A and B are shown apart, each in its own frame.
Chain A
Amino acid sequence: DLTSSNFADSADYEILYEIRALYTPFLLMELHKKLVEAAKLLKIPKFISEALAFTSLVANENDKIYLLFQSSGKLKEYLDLVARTATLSN
């Protein structure tokens, strides 16, 4: 639900909440798997920002991918691959 002028239903909202939750961070996460299993770190295999540049590119209020995203459950899965993007320049 994005507005409250149109028709919405609450029974039918919790199965937006959770169905969103199941898959939207996966698509996010497979962008971040390409960093360390396709080795494309920016738009060239050099420089490691675009994992460090993504740490508040995941954070947006224009797509609102922030508010559903777990502070330990999805954020810990996310930073461990950043930490493997960092060791391509360690």
Chain B
Amino acid sequence: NFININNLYDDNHLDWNHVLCKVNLKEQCIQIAEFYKDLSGLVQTLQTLDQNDSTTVSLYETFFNEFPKEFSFTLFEYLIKHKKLNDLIFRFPQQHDVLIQFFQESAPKYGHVAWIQQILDGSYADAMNTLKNITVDDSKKGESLSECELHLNVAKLSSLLVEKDNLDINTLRKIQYNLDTIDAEKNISNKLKKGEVQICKRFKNGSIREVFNILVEELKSTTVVNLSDLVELYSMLDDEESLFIPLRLLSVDGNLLNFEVKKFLNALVWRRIVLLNASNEGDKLLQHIVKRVFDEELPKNNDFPLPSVDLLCDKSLLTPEYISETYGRFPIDQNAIREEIYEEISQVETLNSDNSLEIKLHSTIGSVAKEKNYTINYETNTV
């Protein structure tokens, strides 16, 4: 069964022996011009060295665009790779290849692997509308930093003045949504060079500060972000310049959350904070960050439980299968995080005796209620 490796040699050295029937003398090369119903290599490399709009009156092709198993294999093999344009293997469109690709895209063969006319040709209408399929493959990332910036500034500036009608404004929206994740790394690279991050002296110990410390070390230099690791370093983050930034991610990237996973992320962060508030008296730590949850109007833009007693007293919310892979994406030990999260739970229940940690959640929402309607809940854990 060495079939595939035989016929490797076969089509290779038919294409080689169809540019070797071109550096030989000629008369019976007519018997390639005429001469197929199956087995390609008669127009795959027999005009694919020059422009294909100068050979639409030639025998090689437009004679094989009616022979089956010849017609379909020319335009298939030319639209495999042309993508990334900020590379040494293609470089950018401006000359020869651009005008061939025009032909092969508005065609019975299809895009989403090439979009070269949908950045620059002339077209706005067919270009940016079919470009919309491609700007969910720039969902929280660029390809190159310099390439993503090129697609989006062209799609932005194209869509600044809408002249395929003027009502067709959808084409601005997700284009803006994607410019942020390259802008972020530029800004933050210079900012950690100055540096402003601070670390907790309570949870310094453990494998729980290693989600935080990695992200820091990656972001000294220009690096495309991951979002869920930010929610998951929450309660191990210190300083009051940032201590409220994944409240944003719960809202606007809570859309990228699945609406079942988001609940147990919330169960993790408020169970860490209740213990952290046992070493703070006054309950002021909780009081300021539950103010920011009420003045952005978090529970009324999406479902969101406010810290309360049930969401940290049950061990039916503990899901190990989730922890073994959201901290199984970094080189920390999987048991090390899982038994740490376990002992948070049994410390909530050892101090729900004499109402110790219970009253401290009750009085936090209960004092930021003298000027807002938000008050303690626990029959659903939502107001």
Interface status of B166 (Cβ within 8 A of chain A): yes
Chain A residues contacting B121 (CB-CB under 8 Å) are: 55-56, 58-59, 75
| Residue ID in chain A nearest B58 by CB atoms | A90
Question: Smallest CB–CB gap between B164 and chain A, Å?
Answer: 7
| Inter-chain contact A58/B122, CB cutoff 8 Å | yes
Interface status of B298 (Cβ within 8 A of chain A): no
Question: Smallest CB–CB gap between B195 and chain A, Å?
Answer: 37
Which chain A residues (61-79) contact chain B, with CB distance < 8 Å? 61, 64-72, 74-75, 78-79
A17, A52, A64: most-surrounded residue (chain B CB, <10 A): A52
Chain B residues contacting A52 (CB-CB under 8 Å) are: 95-96, 98-99
Task: Identify whether the interface residues of B are mostly helix, strand, loop, or mixed.
Answer: loop
A62 to B119, CA, bound (A): 14
Task: Identify whether the interface residues of A are mostly helix, strand, loop, or mixed.
Answer: loop
| Inter-chain contact A56/B98, CB cutoff 8 Å | yes
Interface status of A42 (Cβ within 8 A of chain B): no
Interface status of B154 (Cβ within 8 A of chain A): yes
| Residue ID in chain B nearest A18 by CB atoms | B163
| Inter-chain contact B163/A56, CB cutoff 8 Å | no
| Given known A69-B122, A90-B54, contact A61–B154 (CB-CB < 8 A) | yes
Q: Which of B124, B162, B166 contacts A66 (CB 8 A)?
A: B124
Interface status of A14 (Cβ within 8 A of chain B): yes
| Residue ID in chain B nearest A2 by CB atoms | B161
Interface status of B215 (Cβ within 8 A of chain A): no
Question: Smallest CB–CB gap between A90 and chain B, Å?
Answer: 4
A43 to B153, CA, bound (A): 32
Interface status of B297 (Cβ within 8 A of chain A): no
What number of B residues sit within 8 Å (CB to CB) of A?
A: 29
Chain A residues contacting B99 (CB-CB under 8 Å) are: 52, 55, 79, 82
| Inter-chain contact A53/B95, CB cutoff 8 Å | yes
Interface status of A39 (Cβ within 8 A of chain B): no
Q: Which of B54, B102, B158 contacts A67 (CB 8 A)?
A: B158
Interface status of A41 (Cβ within 8 A of chain B): no
| Inter-chain contact A61/B157, CB cutoff 8 Å | yes
| Inter-chain contact A55/B124, CB cutoff 8 Å | no
A90 to B102, CA, bound (A): 20
Q: Mark B131-167, 1 if CB is under 8 A from A, else 0.
A: 0000000000000000000000110011111111010
The 9 A-B residue pairs with the shortest CB-CB distance, nearest first, are A71-B123, A59-B120, A68-B163, A71-B126, A61-B157, A56-B120, A90-B54, A71-B125, A69-B122
Chain B: residues with CB nearer than 8 A to chain A? 51, 53-54, 93-96, 98-99, 102, 120-127, 153-154, 157-164, 166
Chain A: residues with CB nearer than 8 A to chain B? 1, 13-14, 17, 20-21, 49, 52-53, 55-59, 61, 64-72, 74-75, 78-79, 82-83, 86-87, 89-90
